[PDB]
Amino acid sequence: KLIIKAQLGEDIRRIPIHNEDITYDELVLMMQRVFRGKLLSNDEVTIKYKAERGDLITIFDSSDLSFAIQCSRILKLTLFVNGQPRP
């Protein structure tokens, strides 16, 4: 359904999400689980996402998260005309 691909430094975790009404606080908890050995219980986790055209945008709460998820569903196509990308 939905894949969350999360990066902390060089470590990348790929998490499949089924309930799409996931809350911000649930997402934080999930990040804490998947990055178990990288974090202390008292670390403060900040979450950003790659927006359309690669700029990071901070997610502060569940409504930011929901919008970020809706903005996720992009299919990026490149078209070729008679085999040429630049006719």
Rounded distance between C-alpha atoms, residue 87 and residue 81, angstroms = 7
Domains annotated for the chain, with CATH where assigned, are 2-70 (3.10.20.90)
Rounded distance between C-alpha atoms, residue 51 and residue 16, angstroms = 19
Rounded distance between C-alpha atoms, residue 65 and residue 22, angstroms = 8
Of 14, 9, 8, 6, which Cα lies nearest the Cα of 65? 6
Whether 65 contacts 22, CB under 8 Å: yes
10 Å CB burial of residue 36 (0-12, 13-18, 19+) is exposed
Rounded distance between C-alpha atoms, residue 74 and residue 87, angstroms = 25
To one decimal place, what's the resolution in Å? 1.9
Of 2, 9, 52, 10, which Cα lies nearest the Cα of 27? 2
Query: What are 16's strand-pairing partners?
Result: 3
Please name the method used to determine this structure.
Answer: X-ray
